[PDB]
Amino acid sequence: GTWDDIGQGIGRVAYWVGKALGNLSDVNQASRINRKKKH
Numbered sequence: 272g273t274w275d276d277i278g279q280g281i282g283r284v285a286y287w288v289g290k291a292l293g294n295l296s297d298v299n300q301a302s303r304i305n306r307k308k309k310h
Contacts, residue, residue, distance in 0.1 A: 302309075 298305075
């Protein structure tokens, strides 16, 4: 399956795009359990 090659690229690329966009998506979900200690 091409997933082998496609997975090798997206893996390293994902790290490049992350910072390119800002990298702050996972933190958005954390707010559901971070607002309690966001003082």
